């Protein structure tokens, strides 16, 4: 078109039609020059960590990359609080990308003073990958996502990529993919970009807490005709050996049987935010779960969803299990308790194992007459035939999805850290400034991104007569109010909101 | 319609049509006043219950409940010996319920007698929880199902849930649920209610014994091509460290490659039937198998599905590892051996592990000149990628169906006390008399109920030439007829019937 | 076949005596030493984790002697600093196994199954 | 912290008499794993039992011990000539610190 015309709108709202959910969330971006231009190995020995767990060896590139991928870019606190709380599930359907508005910039620095002005003859390139033929970073919930606050204005990451590596060396099997050999469209000033993507099937993420606890699915009122064996002496003495079998009834409910058992667990250690509870020693790396691969151990976070703590005890913290978020303005390197916000699983302690606790007994030996009946504590319990489980919830501040890796078998592949697992994810979306004369001029770029993700949901259909517990905001008063700006305009979080508020039967 | 003619007629018999079977069963049957019209709370601390294990919180109903769930309401054990040695497996199909000649009888109550009159303007509630909203109790295999012999006369049983509890005390969280708010049909003597039902679709019940054992599939004639380390050492000596490998082969078939891997095993403690064998102390609850939840020990009953004993000695059982039922007759609490009957899965051997057993070795450290190589037994087993098991055999006498609890994820869903899991089980059907005035007219009604379900088949495809391993009775006389009524007209159920009879190869 | 012995220092001064190990890696094993005086009693000296990364010691000797332990050579070196006469006693080194069963079915013990056997070191 | 146990025990041969170890300081349990050491005069000491009433591979069933009462203790069953020479008792507490008995001798009459 013309440079005197504009190559887009501003759109961020949400639609609540029906069933569905229309989100929209526009921003306003800068991107920088990366690497003047340049591909560059990157290895542990240029950074110079020495231990042997950190070795690493990839590819730092002159690209950007959008991240959306987290929950807060395209919910508003009160859009959120309108969903948790009458919905029993939520997913996504379509996905909408518009990238306009390119504003390419030049910086003319003199002595002590640098002078900008815009280019008119320079252009940004930008292209996504549907094919996945490069590798996927989207998934490990790095930093420099849209920003929750749409006022704020944010700078586009940096893109790079690793490979196989033995110490800081590669080997031959390493791969190196450069990104221009991708076709890419090109912008200038006028020019806009877009493309349309459906999400793949995925389940309705849960939001809702059980009410009924596995174990008591029975009825109180009526026995069951099973038995089970009370007892094997007769009393104190010598040569009392008997066997005695009684009902299962609800006057004693742990011994009767049933028909399904809680999911997998493999232990974590438990951390007290009471200091002197804690052990005295340096445990936290020593101590902590973690799965060794290739000779690099590599700790276990967050883990297998599992509850965090038992009811009543909530000031136990399972040391890797559960995410840690930093409140606004959280210093990078040892930070005290306060400034981080621990989540806790109290929901799924229902239908799973606590993360501090074992699974259970099996009895290790043949009791007779010669030896007594032993048992040994079980650590971590693979999948058995007949268990159910809930995975990990999501929060406001949480990853939405993560791409399954592509591989020849895997089982239940919903993400660790939550979300929804796809063989398909939204595509990367890579872009750059077009490099203009290793003499460069010194030059970036700003545009608006606007993001539309229409979002299905599941009503609530229970029967239940008391109230609900829904998310409330407290009437107390306060020097701010919640999830708005201070004195000095900085858009804070007060804590993670998790999403499972409403009860179901199990 | 009238009072002067019945709503309904009297169906028992089974039809054998081609692959299906309609089984029919038709009851005379009792509903009482329950809590005298009330919903009570109840807690372990109400009834007085001290242990922290059986902490249960719930509510008691008014409501009865219809049970059907179990195999010997539509089978006659003719039918059920037409059924086992002829097939390879049944699943439920259709069901359809009807319920008809609805009665109701008001009880006059004076110091010198008591005079029962029928009392036509009260009417009986009936309705079915279709979309279930409310808890599930029918597949805890609880006491009040419908009775083998269609001559006895059966009473309902109270339906009440348990919910969520912190101890004696109930939480936030749990959720009371009223019968009431259900919209339900009301019927008078006239009136009969009736409602048909479709399965959803479930895998065929497995019903037949593997001739072949999962390790001896080979071939005994034919050396593998694959080789195995058979020697580590030349000799007695010093210095005698080398490597010598051999063929695999018939000579010795335990060390060849093999496909695939037995399925996963909890250990459970093994208790001899002999009581002179089994140690001389208190082990009934110290020695089980139990998974820990939330804090409360709840014992693995029966758990995974695990052969029951070696072969050869059948005097020894799992703990906790075996569905016992009770002789005709036995008491409730405290019987001894003979009372009860024991059922055995020594059937499924041959692709399961024994129960009593360790599923194998793995070992524990690196070899070296220093050290040797150590071993140490596997005492529960996850799954593995490539293993095979049997399910659990399902009984004359055991539950049918059980519903699988909503949840995120599961392995298996197929009950652990055996049959069909089913996400969607056939549904609840509430009962109870219609207050008629806190002070209420004594009040109790009877009347008929049918339960129809359609049975598909699978045939017996084998062709193998000796004969099959049947289920028939012994020709010794006796002083009655297994499966018939004694001296007094009280039906009696000798022993356990199990499924698994013809053979199929593996 | 486990089995070890321990390293033999004149007596009057502090010394780092050995703990060699033979039948078994020093790595994976937590180890400790046991000295007793003679005629009276057995009393634990310290003891290592696995990992090494974990140590302690008995407040007589806390504060005083230091442990170490060189897993390429198989020996366990303790070293004792600035004697008193109420050290001169017979020292052990003790092998002690920690929760023997597998993790899937793991039972938590504690005791000392292997005993080098004792060479007494006296402060004069 | 002071393991306390009896130091006077003899017991004629055919005699079973029960040594109790038990703490000062609060009750013993299985969660202060006890154990059993006899050592034999010219010789290093041999665990004979740990963890309460397991047995070590090498320990005769003639004695078995278990925990009684406050204080677990082991249970000498029909002393024989050979199973006697001085005992110590440990319980394993807190990280990597055990406290040992006074010691015990038996002897056959």
């Known amino acids: 078109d013309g440079v005197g015309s504009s190559s887009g709108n501003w759109h961020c709202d949400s639609q609540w039609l029906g069933d569905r959910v229309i989100t929209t969330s526009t921003r306003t971006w800068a991107l920088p020059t990366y690497n003047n231009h340049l591909y560059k190995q990157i290895s542990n020995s240029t950074s110079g960590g020495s231990s042997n767990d950190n070795a690493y060896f990839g590819y730092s590139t002159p690209w950007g990359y959008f991240d959306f991928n987290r929950f807060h870019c395209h919910f508003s606190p009160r859009d959120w609080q309108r969903l948790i709380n009458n919905n029993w599930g939520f997913r996504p359907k379509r996905l909408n990308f518009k990238l306009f508005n390119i504003q390419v910039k030049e910086v003319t620095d003199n002595n002590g003073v640098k002078t900008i002005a815009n280019n008119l003859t320079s252009t940004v390139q930008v292209f996504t990958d549907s094919d996945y033929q490069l590798p996927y970073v989207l998934g490990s919930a790095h930093e420099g996502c849209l920003p929750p606050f749409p006022a704020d204005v944010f700078m586009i990451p940096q893109y790079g990529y690793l490979t196989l590596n033995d110490g800081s060396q590669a080997v031959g099997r390493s791969s190196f993919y450069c990104l221009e050999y991708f076709p890419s469209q090109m912008l200038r000033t006028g020019n806009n970009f877009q493309f349309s993507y459906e999400f793949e099937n995925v389940p309705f993420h849960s939001s809702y807490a059980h009410s009924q606890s596995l174990d008591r699915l029975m009825n109180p009122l009526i026995d069951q005709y099973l038995y089970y064996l009370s007892k094997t002496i007769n009393g104190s003495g010598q040569n009392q050996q008997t066997l005695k079998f009684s009902v299962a009834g609800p006057s004693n409910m742990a011994v009767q049987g049933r028909n399904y058992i809680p999911g997998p667990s493999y232990r974590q250690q438990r951390v007290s935010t009471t200091v002197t509870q804690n052990n005295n020693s340096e445990f936290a790396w020593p101590g902590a779960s973690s799965w060794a691969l290739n000779g690099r151990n590599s700790l276990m976070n967050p883990g297998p969803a599992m509850a965090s703590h038992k009811e009543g005890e909530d000031r136990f913290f399972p040391l890797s299990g559960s995410l840690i978020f930093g409140k606004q303005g959280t210093g990078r390197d040892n930070v005290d308790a306060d400034k981080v916000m621990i989540t806790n699983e109290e929901e799924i302690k229902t239908t799973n194992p606590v993360a501090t606790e074992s699974y259970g007994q099996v009895a290790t030996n043949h009791q007779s007459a010669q030896a007594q009946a032993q048992t040994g504590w079980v650590q971590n319990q693979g999948i058995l035939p007949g268990m159910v489980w809930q995975d990990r919830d999501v929060y406001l501040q949480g990853p939405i999805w993560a791409k399954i890796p592509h591989t020849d078998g895997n089982f239940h592949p919903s993400p660790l850290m939550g979300g929804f697992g796809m063989k398909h994810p939204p595509p990367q979306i890579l872009i750059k400034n077009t490099p203009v004369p290793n003499s460069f001029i010194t030059q970036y770029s700003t545009g608006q991104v606007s993001v539309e993700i229409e979002w299905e949901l599941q009503k609530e259909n229970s029967k239940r007569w008391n109230p609900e517990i829904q998310y409330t905001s407290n009437y107390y008063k306060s020097n701010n109010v919640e999830f708005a700006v201070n004195t000095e305009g900085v858009y804070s979080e007060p804590r993670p909101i998790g999403t499972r508020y409403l009860t179901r039967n199990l | 319609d009238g009072v002067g003619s019945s709503s309904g007629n009297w169906h028992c018999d089974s039809q054998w049509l081609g692959d299906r079977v309609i089984t029919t069963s038709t009851r005379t049957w009792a509903l009482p006043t329950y809590n005298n019209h009330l919903y009570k709370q109840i807690s372990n601390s109400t009834s007085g219950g001290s242990s922290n294990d059986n902490a249960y919180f719930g509510y008691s109903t008014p409501w009865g409940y219809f049970d059907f769930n179990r195999f010997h309401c539509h089978f006659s054990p003719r039918d059920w010996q037409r059924l086992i040695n002829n097939n390879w497996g049944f699943r439920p199909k259709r069901l359809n319920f009807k319920l008809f000649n609805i009665q109701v009888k008001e009880v006059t109550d004076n110091n010198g007698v008591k005079t029962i009159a029928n009392n036509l303007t009260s009417t009986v509630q009936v309705f079915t929880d279709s979309d279930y909203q409310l808890p599930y109790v029918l597949g805890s295999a609880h006491e009040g199902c419908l009775p083998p012999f269609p001559a006895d006369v059966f009473m309902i049983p109270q339906y009440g849930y348990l919910t969520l509890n912190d101890g004696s005390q109930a939480v936030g969280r749990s959720s009371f649920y009223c019968l009431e708010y259900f919209p339900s049909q009301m019927l008078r003597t006239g009136n009969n209610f009736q409602f048909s039902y479709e399965f959803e679709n479930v895998p065929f019940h497995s019903s037949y014994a593997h001739s072949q054992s999962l390790d001896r599939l080979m071939n005994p004639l034919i050396d593998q091509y694959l080789y195995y380390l058979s020697k580590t050492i030349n000799g007695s000596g010093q210095n005698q460290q080398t490597l010598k490998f051999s063929v695999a082969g018939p000579s010795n078939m335990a060390v060849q490659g093999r496909n695939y891997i037995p399925g996963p095993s909890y250990r459970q403690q093994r208790v001899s039937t002999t009581v002179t064998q089994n140690n001389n102390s208190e082990f009934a609850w110290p020695g089980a198998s139990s998974w820990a939840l939330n804090g409360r020990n709840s014992l693995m009953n029966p758990g995974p599905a695990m052969a029951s004993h070696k072969e050869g000695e059948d005097r020894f059982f799992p703990l906790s590892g075996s569905l016992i039922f009770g002789k005709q007759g036995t008491g409730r609490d405290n019987v001894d051996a003979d009372k009860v009957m024991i059922t055995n899965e020594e059937e499924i051997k041959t692709t399961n592990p024994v129960a009593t057993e360790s599923y194998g070795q793995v070992a524990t450290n690196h070899q070296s000149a220093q050290a040797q190589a150590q071993t140490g037994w596997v005492q529960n087993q996850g799954i593995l990628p490539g293993m095979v098991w049997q399910d659990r055999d399902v009984y004359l006498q055991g539950p049918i169906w059980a519903k699988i609890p909503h949840t995120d994820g599961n392995f298996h869903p197929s009950p652990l006390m055996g049959g069909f899991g089913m996400k969607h089980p056939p549904p609840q059907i509430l009962i109870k008399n219609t207050p008629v005035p806190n002070s209420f007219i004594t009040q109790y009604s009877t009347g008929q109920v049918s339960v129809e379900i359609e049975w598909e088949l699978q045939k017996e495809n084998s062709k193998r030439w000796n004969p099959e391993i049947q289920y028939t009775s012994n020709y010794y006389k006796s002083n009655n007829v297994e499966f018939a009524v004694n001296t007094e007209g009280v039906y009696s159920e000798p022993r356990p019937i199990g499924t698994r009879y013809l053979t199929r190869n593996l | 076949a486990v089995e070890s012995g321990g390293g033999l220092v004149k007596p009057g001064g502090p010394l780092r005596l050995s703990c060699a190990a033979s039948?078994?890696?020093?790595?994976?094993?937590?180890m400790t030493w046991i000295r007793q005086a003679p005629g009276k009693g057995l009393e634990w000296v310290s003891y290592?984790?696995?990992?090494?990364?974990?140590?302690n010691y008995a407040d007589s000797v806390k504060g005083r002697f230091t442990i170490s332990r060189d897993n390429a050579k198989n020996s366990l070196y303790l070293q004792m600093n600035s004697l008193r006469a109420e050290d001169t006693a017979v020292y052990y080194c003790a092998r002690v196994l920690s929760s023997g069963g597998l993790t899937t079915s793991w039972r938590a013990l504690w005791y000392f199954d292997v005993w080098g056997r004792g060479t007494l070191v006296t402060v004069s | 912290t002071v393991v306390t146990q009896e130091p006077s025990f003899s017991v004629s041969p055919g005699g079973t008499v029960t040594l109790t170890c038990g703490l000062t300081?609060?009750?013993?349990?299985?969660?202060?794993?006890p154990s059993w050491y006899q050592q034999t005069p010219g010789q290093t000491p041999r665990t004979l039992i740990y963890s309460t009433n397991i047995r070590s591979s090498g320990v005769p069933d003639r004695f078995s011990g278990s925990i009684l009462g406050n204080k677990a203790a082991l249970t000498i069953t029909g002393a024989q000539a050979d199973d006697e020479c001085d005992y110590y008792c440990?319980?394993?507490?807190?990280?990597?610190?055990?406290?040992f008995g006074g010691g015990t001798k038996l002897t056959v009459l």
């Open positions: 290592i984790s696995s990992s090494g990364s974990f140590i």
């Open positions: 440990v319980l394993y507490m807190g990280s990597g610190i055990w406290v």
């Open positions: 300081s609060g009750s013993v349990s299985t969660s202060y794993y």
């Open positions: 039948g078994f890696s020093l790595s994976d094993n937590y």
